Design a protein around this ligand. Structure first.
Ligand SMILES: Cc1cc(S(=O)(=O)N(C)[C@H](C)C(=O)NO)ccc1F
Ligand SMILES: [Zn+2]
Length: 507
């Protein structure tokens, strides 16, 4: 119909609901839409002199564990600290390796103090598993209270009359689904264009989507802003619960499923966009598809690996908006793995992982919210969110779809790095089954690393375990030039690793 008539019709549908809201209810919906940011003045006031100085001249970008946002906040802090020096000083202080331990340990605790109070982010990061011990207990309980109260606010459905008469819209950054394919879904040559090849891939793997937080959608399609190249057009179901927000928006109930009906490249004002047509379905319907896929991928890989038929090895921990791609990519990642690694190394190491009740966890929630990590890591400041992780205590590999890794081409290479950690673990075990340690903790590898540790990737300089893993990754790259660079620039490492590989296969 008319944009303005549509708006007024939906507003009227929710008018009694709106008028019945308490001040407390309104305050909650506003806090949901506008997270409470940390006040940087209080943060800085809480630091010691040595800490201000440390923060002042610190190489911030170089973290294993700090998001783009968190990195941006901390430099907002850094400036404020340095906004009292010479104009010459600040000019010098940013023309200038990896992080020191004193720096890293500082940042690991400072991380806990710069988190906004952001209900929708908590829901997305945990995939709705809000009891996950990844934040302070008192704050965790606050989120829970707010979330339950919002759930109780959103009781009125869009209804049987309006649901098939309206579309709702959501503009979205490509990077919010996966930070990888974001940079390469837009044509590098002409930014007004979509990369057709990539797009076809994206399209083929995007069949369903979960919202574990509360979607805020526009009643009328809004022109794209910067980094808004996805334009969702959504059709609700009759019993989808929602609330009217000022300025022609709806907040949708959390835990809904979306079936992707169509993905097209479209033109709006001389730029190409990606239209995504989606229909709201019950979340349980999608969870069913995920569980079925989980069964299928384990059945297939249990066969190919010589494991018992009902080994629980592969876990899909999937709860967010790029859901089906997480499932689809797990298949690809494991194919790359078997393709680029000797089948006897795979089988020996994996059987060891399985012996410890280990998992390959493919997920779209942050890794601190994965049990295979947090059950062994009680201290939040020691919890890690990243593209990938190996956890020896649970013998598990964790791989987070939406993020991008430090100097990493794709997810498959990330996985092979983690498998490298696992090889490190198993070799060390075979050495001394009693006092079971990592082979990169041996005196031999320590000395090899003291000599060759700077010769491979920048990230590899971190420590022995990472050096090994990076070396192991590069040695099993599909690009054979990368393999040779390892033999060339770090010969003892190359030899050491092949030794461990031989040693494992013959055990
Ligand atoms: C290069 C590269 C980077 C990553 S990571 O997830 O970005 N990362 C820094 C983490 C802490 C790591 O060492 N996990 O084992 C993962 C794999 C990989 F090959
Ligand atoms: Zn690593």
């Amino acid at each position: 119909l008319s944009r303005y008539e549509k708006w007024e019709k939906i507003k009227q549908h929710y008018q009694h609901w709106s008028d019945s809201l308490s001040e407390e209810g309104r305050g909650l919906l506003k806090k949901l839409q506008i997270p409470i940011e940390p006040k940087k003045d209080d943060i800085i006031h809480s630091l010691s002199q040595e800490e201000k100085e440390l923060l002042k001249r610190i190489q911030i970008d170089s973290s294993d564990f700090l998001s783009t946002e968190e990195k941006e906040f901390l430099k907002k802090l850094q400036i404020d600290i340095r906004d009292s020096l010479s104009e010459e000083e600040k000019e010098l202080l940013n023309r200038i390796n990896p992080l020191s331990e004193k720096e890293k340990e500082f940042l690991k605790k400072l991380k806990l103090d710069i988190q906004p109070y952001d209900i929708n982010q908590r829901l997305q990061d945990t995939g709705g598993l809000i009891d996950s011990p990844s934040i302070n207990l008192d704050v965790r309980k606050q989120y829970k209270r707010d979330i339950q109260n919002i759930d109780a606010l959103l009781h009125q459905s869009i209804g049987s009359t309006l649901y098939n008469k309206i579309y709702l819209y959501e503009n979205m950054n490509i990077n919010n689904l996966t930070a990888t394919l974001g940079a390469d879904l837009v044509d590098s040559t002409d930014n007004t264009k979509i990369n057709r090849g990539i797009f076809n891939e994206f399209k083929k793997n995007f069949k369903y989507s979960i919202s574990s937080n509360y979607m805020i959608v526009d009643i009328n399609e809004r022109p794209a802003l910067d980094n808004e190249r996805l334009k969702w057009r959504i059709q609700l179901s009759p019993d989808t619960r929602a609330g009217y927000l000022e300025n022609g928006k709806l907040i949708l109930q959390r835990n809904i499923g979306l079936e992707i009906k169509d993905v097209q490249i479209i033109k709006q004002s001389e730029k190409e966009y990606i239209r995504i047509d989606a229909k709201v379905v019950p979340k349980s319907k999608i969870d069913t598809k995920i569980q079925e896929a989980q069964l299928n991928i384990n059945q297939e890989w249990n066969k190919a690996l010589g494991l018992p038929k009902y080994t629980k090895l592969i876990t899909f921990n999937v709860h967010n908006r790029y859901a089906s791609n997480i499932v689809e990519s797990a298949y690809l990642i494991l194919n790359e793995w078997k393709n680029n690694i000797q089948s006897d190394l795979i089988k020996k190491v994996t059987n060891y992982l399985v012996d410890g009740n280990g998992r390959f966890v493919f997920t779209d929630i942050t890794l601190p919210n994965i049990a295979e990590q947090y059950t062994h890591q009680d201290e939040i400041y020691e919890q890690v969110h990243s593209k990938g992780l190996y956890v020896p205590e649970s013998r598990s590999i964790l791989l987070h779809g939406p993020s991008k890794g430090v100097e990493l081409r794709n997810d498959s290479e990330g996985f092979i790095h983690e498998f490298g950690h696992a090889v490190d673990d198993y070799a060390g075990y075979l050495l001394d089954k009693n006092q079971s340690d990592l082979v990169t903790n041996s005196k031999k590898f320590i000395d090899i690393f003291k000599e060759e540790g700077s010769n491979l990737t920048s990230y590899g300089r971190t420590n022995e375990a990472e050096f090994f893993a990076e070396a192991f990754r590069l040695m099993h790259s599909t690009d054979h030039a990368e393999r040779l660079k390892v033999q060339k620039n770090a010969p003892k490492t190359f030899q050491f690793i092949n030794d461990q590989i031989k040693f494992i296969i013959n055990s």
